[PDB]
């Protein structure tokens, strides 16, 4: 019955207002492969809103690996990994990820999101604590809320705040710090050296979420711990397959006893169907390519360095990024929506960040690079972005 | 750092004990398609532990649809639906599901699990209530814990307990009842007529989780509301693609305003990458097949009716199932583990249910039918199950 439910949703007007004003640009229906250009409503649009940092969703080798796994294994495993849903190829990918990130063991999840839910819900319990960077990804916050622990946020990359908060806690309790590696909104990197120094002082476990780091930073893309040389000071390395690795799913890697505990105790792996064979095989093949072919990462960073320089040169105001995510400040929600739609209508796809996710005054568009972008494409997008910012009067 | 973390996991011994005793049968690595027989360690094993109720993960049409979507769209969409991760085929599948279950609108999630997290986390808030059947799926409990509401469990299919609990609540609050349609442990069906009668009395929203109902009950498999004729008294119909529909993902369908609210407010859709093209296309093609070819559902039920009769005839003690899930009581955890492994070693795959998920005295194995099972296969499995139950002295 719907009386009260109708009242709950009644105040949510922003989408109808966007649509009525002709500004709506969420759920844009793409008609083609995710690529440097996509087709929307039959037209070509430059894609600067993706997470496919290495451009690999179109790699024919990866497509063929996925198609071959469909031929061999079918369309789905129809059960949790725990029961009837494990394949030899899941175990192969676990072994290969473990080797890549330098850990004993790994457990796959059917999404990145569920990869965070798993360890955050089941390791810290009553009388324990989880310490979260305040800008951590929503899946981290949610995973932590599924624990029976006390969840404490600390100031973004604020090591004094982290230390202070840890200091106040009872000695006779377990603690686990979870942080994004690269934070996607502003594209900045966690201060992992200090964070791990503090963790070691207070015997706190460390978990890093490398969604946006894998295939981006670290040796041959192996992530944030790798980037800093701090493999031995990070207990759990979490990643996703939906970004550089061009697929769907994620994993948590760590010590075999911890991973064994997780795979038998995390609700998000015991009570959710396993990754499809196609996604296992595309992740396996992408992981090979990222390591074997250094040009992908190199070109991603050439593009990043070029675009960033070109944006700064044109007088855009960028956030403190250290990654291929280039946040461009606009500082007005209305303007952010207008710019986003005007760019769409002129063939450029960027992602808006607006209230209530951030304050109006920090609203921005996020311009992300892929290895497969050309300098010409970047130049066209920036040309158009200059014109639109003027039309919008930013 | 790992001192306290090591202590947290130190008491979890059951897996090492199972392994050391040669009883361990979780995460069994399958080497073939999910089918009525699977290959494990090079040997053939009858599969009676699956959720693929219609046997469709091996359907060449569905495989080819998935392979063709890989060719056209690549291996992944590399973003949330909200941003750059929507395809025309996602929208097509939403429209087709909406039509199938008789609702205005639907929103896809990349897993069934996340499909429950979405609406349960974001519709009821502070000062509201979610009422859950105590045997609801873990994803429902978790989704509800992600809300800012008060979560109340009621006794399993206990309409008096539901009514009483609703009665005590403030009038000036929203309420939402969420139930599994078919409950998978015992295979029983919710008392949706009474539940909806109560909901209507207290103006509570109703959400049904049809993971195990779609492709099983209802007209042409359209689920629990369909089975009872109660489409108009159920606000939200949730389903998964990982069972009958032979894929990965799920959906929530309902009124367009509610669905519009969800797709912009549920963290599990805004902050998680979209379904892979292959899984969209396999779900689309399976949904066509389920409707167009009535033989699948018919044969599933012929098998169910045959197996159930054959088990009862051999003196097995079954749970109160109304579905293709046949729970077979053993009532000893040790025996449940032994039986499970002995059957595995003799070429029969069943799923154990043990403490702490249930009391020792209600421990059981779950024997699930698929449309593609033959009577000969059922007979072989039951023959073997008689021998093992004797060897184990149940
Ligand atoms: C009633 C119900 N609701 C939701 C889900 C979650 O769906 P998913 O497995 O597609 O994520 C399941 C999963 N059920 C299986 C895994 O697919 C399990 O082993 O629990 C379910 O049974
Ligand atoms: C740091 C971090 N950790 C975890 C996840 C979840 O991974 P998933 O999208 O593969 O489920 C994301 C998702 N990030 C994207 C969707 O892929 C988003 O729009 O939020 C992430 O950025």
Residue numbers in the entry:
A (entry chain A), B (entry chain A): 2 to 395
Passage from the reporting paper:
Bacterial SPTs from sphingolipid-containing bacteria such as Sphingomonas paucimobilis, which is rich in glycosphingolipids, and Sphingobacterium multivorum, which is rich in phosphosphingolipids, function as a water-soluble homodimer enzyme and are useful as a prototypical model system of human SPT. Based on these enzymological and structural analyses, the synthesis of KDS from d-serine was explained as the result of the slow racemization to l-serine, followed by the reaction with palmitoyl-CoA, and SPT would not catalyze the direct condensation between d-serine and palmitoyl-CoA.
The SPT crystals were soaked in a solution supplemented with 190 mM d-serine for 10 min and subjected to X-ray structure analysis. The final model contained 394 amino acid residues, one PLP, 419 water molecules, and seven ethylene glycol molecules per monomer. Unexpectedly, a model of the PLP–l-serine external aldimine was well assigned at the occupancy of 1 to this electron density map.
